[PDB]
Amino acid sequence: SGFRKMAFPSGKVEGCMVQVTCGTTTLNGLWLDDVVYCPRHVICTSEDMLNPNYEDLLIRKSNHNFLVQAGNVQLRVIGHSMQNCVLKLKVDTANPKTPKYKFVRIQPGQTFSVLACYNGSPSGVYQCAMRPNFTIKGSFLNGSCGSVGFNIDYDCVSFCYMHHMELPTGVHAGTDLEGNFYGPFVDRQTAQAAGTDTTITVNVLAWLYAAVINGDRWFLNRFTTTLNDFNLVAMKYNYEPLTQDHVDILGPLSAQTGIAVLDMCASLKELLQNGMNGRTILGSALLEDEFTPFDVVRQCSGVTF
Amino acid sequence: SGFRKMAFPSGKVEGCMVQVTCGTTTLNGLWLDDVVYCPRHVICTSEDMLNPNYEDLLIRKSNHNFLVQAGNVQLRVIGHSMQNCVLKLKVDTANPKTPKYKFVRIQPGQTFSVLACYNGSPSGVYQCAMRPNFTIKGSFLNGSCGSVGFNIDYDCVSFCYMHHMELPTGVHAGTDLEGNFYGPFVDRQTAQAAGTDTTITVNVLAWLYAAVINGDRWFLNRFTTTLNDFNLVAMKYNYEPLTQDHVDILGPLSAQTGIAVLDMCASLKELLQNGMNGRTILGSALLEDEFTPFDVVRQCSGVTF
Numbered sequence: 171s172g173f174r175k176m177a178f179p180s181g182k183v184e185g186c187m188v189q190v191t192c193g194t195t196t197l198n199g200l201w202l203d204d205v206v207y208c209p210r211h212v213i214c215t216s217e218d219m220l221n222p223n224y225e226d227l228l229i230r231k232s233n234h235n236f237l238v239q240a241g242n243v244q245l246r247v248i249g250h251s252m253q254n255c256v257l258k259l260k261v262d263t264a265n266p267k268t269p270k271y272k273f274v275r276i277q278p279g280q281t282f283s284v285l286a287c288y289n290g291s292p293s294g295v296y297q298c299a300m301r302p303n304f305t306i307k308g309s310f311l312n313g314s315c316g317s318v319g320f321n322i323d324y325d326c327v328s329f330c331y332m333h334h335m336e337l338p339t340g341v342h343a344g345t346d347l348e349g350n351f352y353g354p355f356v357d358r359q360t361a362q363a364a365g366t367d368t369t370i371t372v373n374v375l376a377w378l379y380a381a382v383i384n385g386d387r388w389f390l391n392r393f394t395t396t397l398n399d400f401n402l403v404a405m406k407y408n409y410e411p412l413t414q415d416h417v418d419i420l421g422p423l424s425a426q427t428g429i430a431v432l433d434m435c436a437s438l439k440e441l442l443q444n445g446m447n448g449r450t451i452l453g454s455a456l457l458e459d460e461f462t463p464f465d466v467v468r469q470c471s472g473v474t475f
Numbered sequence: 476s477g478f479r480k481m482a483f484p485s486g487k488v489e490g491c492m493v494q495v496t497c498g499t500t501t502l503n504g505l506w507l508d509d510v511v512y513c514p515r516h517v518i519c520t521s522e523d524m525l526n527p528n529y530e531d532l533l534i535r536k537s538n539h540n541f542l543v544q545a546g547n548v549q550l551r552v553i554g555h556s557m558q559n560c561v562l563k564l565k566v567d568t569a570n571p572k573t574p575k576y577k578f579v580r581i582q583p584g585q586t587f588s589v590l591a592c593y594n595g596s597p598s599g600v601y602q603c604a605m606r607p608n609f610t611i612k613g614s615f616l617n618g619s620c621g622s623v624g625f626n627i628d629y630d631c632v633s634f635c636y637m638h639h640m641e642l643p644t645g646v647h648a649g650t651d652l653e654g655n656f657y658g659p660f661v662d663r664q665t666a667q668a669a670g671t672d673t674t675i676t677v678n679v680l681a682w683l684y685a686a687v688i689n690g691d692r693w694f695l696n697r698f699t700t701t702l703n704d705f706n707l708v709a710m711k712y713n714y715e716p717l718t719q720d721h722v723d724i725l726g727p728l729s730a731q732t733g734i735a736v737l738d739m740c741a742s743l744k745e746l747l748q749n750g751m752n753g754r755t756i757l758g759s760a761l762l763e764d765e766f767t768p769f770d771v772v773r774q775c776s777g778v779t780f
């Protein structure tokens with residue numbers, strides 16, 4: 171019993187982290203097979219991040235300008251190339267610890283674990299969600315760029331995120347492992363703002379289920395609602411609209427608890443308008459929205475890797 | 476910027492997890508050098524759990540009765556001993572992945588990372604606190620006994636917890652790696668309940684410093700109180716008393732922010748009597764008490780391992 175914010179075991183990803191230095195700029199890299207991935211802004215000069223032409227910066231740089239370190243072991247660079255906003259450094263040694271992996275682009279509302287790293291070494295691991303405005307609410311300091319986000323399916327590590335920057339709001343932005351930024355953000359020192367961040371409704375509902383599975387039931391009422399009468403209340407409170415795909419994806423949880431999605435939706439509508447009245451759910455005084463239905467099923471069924 | 480519930484990287488511990496089977500019962504064990512540690516109720520079914528005489532069941536068992544599996548490979552048990560509630564199986568092969576480690580007994584209020592495992596394979600990692608009533612608020616299903624909690628102090632893995640039981644209230648209980656239970660609990664199916672749980676005052680203050688470090692400053696007032704004055708209110712809300720040792724432990728966070736501990740205490744006093752004004756602090760609507768002062772420093776200074 172119980173329910174916690176649970177990250178994936180970080181071991182398989184620890185073995186791919188390395189340190190990447192270009193000039194005086196050091197950050198983290200991801201070493202898979204004979205390729206080291208990292209943010210292209212590592213090649214930037216100090217006065218190059220204002221108006222950077224990375225294509226042209228890469229021509230000026232030799233393979234010898236890139237120092238990669240796996241532990242205290244130097245990996246010789248024998249090639250450098252740029253896919254979108256990620257630098258790809260070809261090295262002469264294949265990572266013996268390369269896991270079965272895939273590069274995936276995640277959607278808003280989907281969660282993942284982040285291995286925060288500095289100078290190629292891990293600091294900690296936590297669970298994040300891709301917000302509906304394509305930012306993440308992480309914990310990153312200077313030197314954290316190149317840290318990756320990931321999920322694990324049995325033995326396959328699906329890398330979904332690489333950390334690039336911090337917006338003035340304290341939120342975080344980055345790319346997939348193919349260099350495409352999530353959201354409208356770019357790696358130029360320009361005024362860029364995230365749209366209104368909305369609450370991931372399907373996750374709050376998955377979370378309420380998890381609450382039900384664990385014995386928290388004070389919020390369950392006997393009223394019901396329709397998908398449109400709930401969404402009318404939802405959009406007033408900056409909640410994402412609920413669709414039939416969301417009702418279906420919660421099927422498993424509805425089928426383990428016997429509670430109809432729309433029944434839980436009525437309980438949720440009551441909590442939005444009236445609050446919690448100094449009560450808590452799963453130890454929280456807020457409606458948590460960084461648990462997907464799969465995360466709930468995973469943590470209430472014992473899925474191992 | 477940012478503040479998340481961050482666990483230690485779990486790689487070093489993943490490489491010590493194995494599966495231990497005795498009869499029909501399987502659970503997780505910890506394989507360090509040539510010894511596997513695991514809960515001693517592995518030698519029990521659901522018949523002797525009334526008044527289990529682990530002394531007889533141990534002698535009545537043979538080395539061949541214990542099946543130990545490290546992934547695919549099978550480890551041959553060549554001896555067995557008991558140290559309180561932990562079983563020690565000597566095997567004929569030493570773990571090549573054994574980290575520098577120590578067995579430590581943690582104090583109430585201290586945190587650690589839990590690597591939840593099932594059938595010797597990790598499922599997830601999350602951060603827990605030893606509650607003042609010597610329970611933890613974990614996430615554990617059937618098959619999870621033997622999962623361990625730990626801290627990483629430099630290059631040394633400090634194992635502090637092995638999971639044994641869930642109490643009917645839904646909280647969890649276990650031992651250090653020497654087999655001594657935290658709290659007045661015993662590894663047998665007899666009536667057991669934890670004392671009343673209090674809030675870890677020193678951890679709440681550390682967390683408020685974390686909020687200040689990350690720009691959350693709305694709850695700061697200009698006031699200052701006395702240690703005795705603060706404790707008078709602390710007791711009214713079921714908060715641990717604040718000792719001078721706690722005050723000193725917060726020294727580093729007071730030094731970084733310029734806010735005296737007794738000034739922070741006055742701000743916490745006002746939050747307790749008047750509530751959080753419908754506002755959040757570091758993404759939470761409750762006062763969080765599972766971050767130690769050290770947890771705050773390492774996440775806000777990027778300590779690596």
Ligand SMILES: *[C@@H](CC(=O)OCC)[C@H](C[C@@H]1CCNC1=O)NC(=O)[C@H](Cc1ccc(F)cc1)NC(=O)[C@H](N)Cc1ccccc1
Nearest residue numbers: 197219310311312313314315334335336337357358359476
């Ligand atoms: C990682 C940089 C790194 O590790 O390599 C040098 C040590 C940085 C992580 C930031 C630091 C603090 N918390 C974080 O999440 N990333 C940056 O520092 C980023 C680098 C950058 C500068 C200019 C660009 F055009 C692209 C990338 N700088 C920032 O995030 C600053 N907040 C400035 C900023 C840049 C883009 C949009 C808004 C603000």
Ligand SMILES: *[C@@H](CC(=O)OCC)[C@H](C[C@@H]1CCNC1=O)NC(=O)[C@H](Cc1ccc(F)cc1)NC(=O)[C@H](N)Cc1ccccc1
Nearest residue numbers: 171500501502524615616617618619620640641662663664
């Ligand atoms: C770990 C058991 C295991 O892995 O072995 C499988 C063969 C269990 C973890 C629990 C399961 C559900 N959620 C959890 O966190 N531990 C137990 O099941 C525990 C084991 C035990 C059985 C018989 C004994 F004599 C000692 C220990 N049993 C329980 O937790 C039950 N809640 C019963 C109970 C025991 C002590 C105090 C209160 C209730």
